[PDB]
Amino acid sequence: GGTSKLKYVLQDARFFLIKSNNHENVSLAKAKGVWSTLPVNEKKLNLAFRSARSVILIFSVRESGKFQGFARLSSESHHGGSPIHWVLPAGMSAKMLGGVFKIDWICRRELPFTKSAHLTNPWNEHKPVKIGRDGQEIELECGTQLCLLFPPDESIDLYQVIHKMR
């Protein structure tokens, strides 16, 4: 129903864990529909955006014990546009995060790691899906089920994110 529309968005997607060292940038991403990541992940995501039906980013603040939501990647990274002043972690320069992706939030509700305890990611040595570095790719079925575990977000029109797929 709502689950059917979501299943359509997730069909044949590639799934990536996104980690943030702070809460602030995830809130900023929720506010403005943008994300930046470090250089290896930026190339990985640009390549996936071009080749995959959908690219899904599942956000988790480092040490928060939760995921904070997930979103569909809606562009490759754009440089030299209107800049985003991210909250940089100690030792991270603004240039390390260069390149801004547009993203379309699907769910901005939290999912505690306890609710994902039955899911392991075979593409990360079969570790619980809550374990992974920034950018860790999640196997299709594991990633699909992780997204379907999140509560419905009644402020996100899932008809609208689908329309945006053109």
From Swiss-Prot:
Swapping residue 96 to A leads to an effect described as: Reduced binding to N6-methyladenosine (m6A)-containing RNAs
Explain what the record says happens when changing residue 105 to D: Does not affect ability to influence alternative splice site selection
* Impact reported for residue 57 to E: Does not affect ability to influence alternative splice site selection
Q: Where is the YTH domain?
A: 13-150
Q: Which residues bind RNA?
A: 19-21, 35-36, 86, 134
Phenotype for residue 69 to I: Abolishes RNA-binding and ability to influence alternative splice site selection
Result when mutating residue 133 to A: Reduced binding affinity for N6-methyladenosine (m6A)-containing RNAs by 100-fold
PTM comment: the record says:
Tyrosine phosphorylated.
Cellular compartments annotated:
Nucleus; Nucleus speckle
Q: Quick one: effect of changing residue 133 to F? A: Reduced binding affinity for N6-methyladenosine (m6A)-containing RNAs by 9-fold
Share the domain note from the entry: The YTH domain mediates RNA-binding.
Protein name as annotated: YTH domain-containing protein 1
Organism per entry: Homo sapiens
Which gene carries the instructions for this protein?
YTHDC1
Q: Which residues of the full protein are shown?
A: 345 to 508 of 727
